[PDB]
């Protein structure tokens, strides 16, 4: 599987989407799982999810990489709602659109507050709900706010340089040889190819902060099965607030992976991947 | 299997242990996986393990059910050294007994305190390390301590009865239906057939204070790989101390229960032989 | 001072109350400070404050230890909304019928609610907040819920006896030497005074149980200056909800006592007079 | 009273000092406080305390603003051991040099550290201790580390710039409009004077880095009352270390300032300045 062969585009329609152009990658044909991406620059579907793709299609199911509203190859856009909720609205219209009745989700950062937004918007349409360090959940009990790795994802939307990208992603990835020049390049061409997208995020974050984003009071009507993942090392949203989910939904597990960061379903893909599948045959 | 089917003993001889007789039951011949048992009055192998010995056994493994010295068919002692420590004497004489090179330890509460002081002592006889909500782990840093549950153990241990039996069990577990009268019936028995275990685990306790059980400085050198699994409400052992463990052993996972006790592998028997057998499978 | 010397009646009208006999125990005639106490079978204002009426008064406040609906000389009652906001309605009542412009508050534990019901009802009618231990405030991070104090109040409610009453005086104090005869037979006799008031409070919980206390959500309301205290062994409400006051309320500060329980007021009087008379003459 | 006025060498000796300069800055003349800096490229004593050093002299202290071993006007060093252990030794050099036999300390970061290890390794040295942000006590339960401001801390010691600098004090304090050209410009002074205590720094946490300055484990030790402040948005020591002091040190208590960074007696002097003055008078 590649990008290139796995390459998609859908127009939906949906609550203020009309005709929007969304990019998505897709493999497999079982059961659908939707994977949603974080909201630093230069994000993006089979970027972030590349070492996902492969085993949860060999499981059995049709993955769906998705790239968000002003994100990667999707319609660029200017939010002036908190962005967790127009995303879920365009996971349904992409949906509606490629006639599925029911999806289970995997949402990453900000991809984990679109997850929780859909859940609590379209509770009839989605199976079970995977979430990998999700934002936007309010304040922490323990972490000072903003945390180190979102002041460093606003500068580099701000003033996007190659430095300031290995500056975000030495503090985005808790095992530092994971930082290659493929990664670096792979990001930068991504900040490179669409800055129209840096532009947006930043009017859109002015119209509605992250200060807006907090579903917590609304947690206890997510009925799905739940597993909440967490990097021990994530310094980009707090291990707290996995606490504060386990607490809070009905139905849900915790999984905390040490030497970890902000991207937990690529720097401990293997482990990932075995969990998640699992729960979603199993649980 | 069945207790009686699966029925062992085997005498010890280990530094302070001489011909000293240890009940265990036994199934399946792969890989040896011993299982160590909590503290409570009436504790013992099969009693704290039979929903996860036929899984495991299923799997492939050697399923050892321990009986701690002190407790149900194992010969009667009195402790002047922490627990933990001469549990895993206990352990590794069993082993030596039974030419046994290595086993993967399952350690549940006081169990969880013998297998860290297994692996403390005897690296080189260790695979992987499974704990949950190992005990004396010291101080927490938001239970106040002795912890609810801690407080009716000793209660029971003194003063035993089977209306401070049922009291007990309700704050061992989360979900109150399952407490069964086949559940009490078999704790009560334990506890009334053997009352010297009752007698001797108060004098060994007045010996040696679970404040000297704290191995928390040694958790450095741990080597073996690490499953930590906590209930999300356990009234017996503090939820930080997951954290602790996480944050102090080099390989370690956490994994945490919603709607779940001190009893972990029974209460979410299947999520946790699934989680557990998968981890010694590819961990 | 005395509880005789100083106790006064005064009848309260204000939504839902009408000619509503409150009890409350006055002395000092400077800035007014409502003292509101906790919500244990047999609880009253001079019961829970009587070691700090004095230096607040000598200090120059005029100190009013109220009883609020339901407990000790005040009006019975049976609530069907949570008691926080029935509360403050009735301190707000007390006010205008005494022509109080504005009143400092200290609330231990169910007081601590209505204090914070208070300030988020009738913000131009307090001026500096006192929290001790406030209850309601939603799910702990770390504690299972019910606390352990929290049951022995339940318990104590619906079967009251002396030997009951002290296994929660147990729980509900650090130091077991402050558990002495004379404070055992005064909560008794509040307790075998007013059996009306267990009844009545029993009815209540289960018209809005504790989980529609949470006013977590408006705590970015207040405007008051506010002091938190939490006892570092508190059994009945948990300590991570003081780092919840403290991040949510915009000018708060957190003082945490070590080998305190839940009457932090009474097992650390001098410590606790002298910081919240220094905080009201100087914050 | 100004730097100038206050300014005083002595010259100590003491296990492993030989005729070694210590700069401080005295004012007043009763009970003896010493007051212990961190450990950021330029501190020192005046520059950390000079809000406080006034209001401690007029209510009857012998104020002593120390500069540690290798920081601003003291000697430069290069030490092979934990520099709280270091630090401690040269504070008793210097009271034995001054023929002072017992002193309050007041630490904060790397000065809370030193301060730790006098108080265990001199107890008929010390009255009462004060701590701020502590340094050094091991892992944190909750944040990643390095934390933010260490990183920061590192970096300034290895490049130093006056960008940098402004760097690490913007995410030093909480509050931005207190980063002034004065105080940018003093620290950038101390700074341009002394670069071989920037290298010295450097070598000395290469022989001895920041993991073997954990004294957790002999916390128990400490007899003197202890007072624990903490910044709730303090990004260089982690908020949980203020409950893992209030757990392990027999008599403590602990205040958590709101909008407060790592410099609490500098960002809200007038509070810190009244509760610690309290804590020495009535304690
Ligand atoms: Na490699
Ligand atoms: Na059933
Ligand atoms: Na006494
Ligand atoms: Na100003």
């Known amino acids: 599987l590649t990008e290139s062969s796995t390459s998609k585009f859908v127009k939906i329609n949906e609550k203020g989407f009309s005709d ?23 994000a993006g579907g089979w970027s ?44 349904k219209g992409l949906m509606d659109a490629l006639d599925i009745d029911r999806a289970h989700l995997v949402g990453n950062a900000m991809g984990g507050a679109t997850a929780l937004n859909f859940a609590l918007e379209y509770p ?20 000072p706010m903003p945390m180190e790795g979102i002041k460093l994802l606003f500068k580099l939307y701000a003033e996007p340089s190659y430095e300031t990208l290995k500056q975000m992603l030495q503090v985005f990835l808790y095992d530092q040889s994971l930082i290659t020049e493929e990664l670096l390049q792979g990001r930068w061409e991504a900040i490179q190819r669409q800055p129209e997208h840096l532009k947006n995020f930043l009017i859109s974050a002015q119209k509605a902060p992250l200060s807006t984003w907090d579903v917590t009071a609304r947690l206890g009507e997510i009925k799905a099965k739940t597993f909440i993942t967490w990097g021990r090392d994530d310094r980009f949203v707090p291990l707290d607030h996995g606490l504060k989910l386990l607490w809070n939904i009905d139905d849900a597990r915790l999984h905390v992976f040490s030497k970890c960061g902000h991207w937990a379903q690529w720097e401990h893909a293997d482990e990932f991947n075995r969990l998640v599948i699992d729960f979603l045959r199993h649980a």
Chains 1, 2, 3, 4 share one sequence.
């Open 48 to 91: 972030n999810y590349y070492r996902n793709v492969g085993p949860f299609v060999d499981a059995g199911y049709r993955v769906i990489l998705k790239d968000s509203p002003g994100f990667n190859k999707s319609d660029a856009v200017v939010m002036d709602e908190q962005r967790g909720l127009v995303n879920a609205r365009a996971v």
């Open 124 to 143: 009839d349409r989605i199976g079970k709900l995977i979430l990998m360090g999700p934002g936007g959940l309010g304040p922490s009990m323990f972490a």
């Open 20 to 42: 929007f152009n969304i990019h998505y990658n897709e493999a497999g044909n079982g059961e659908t799982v939707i994977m949603l991406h974080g909201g630093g620059p230069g």
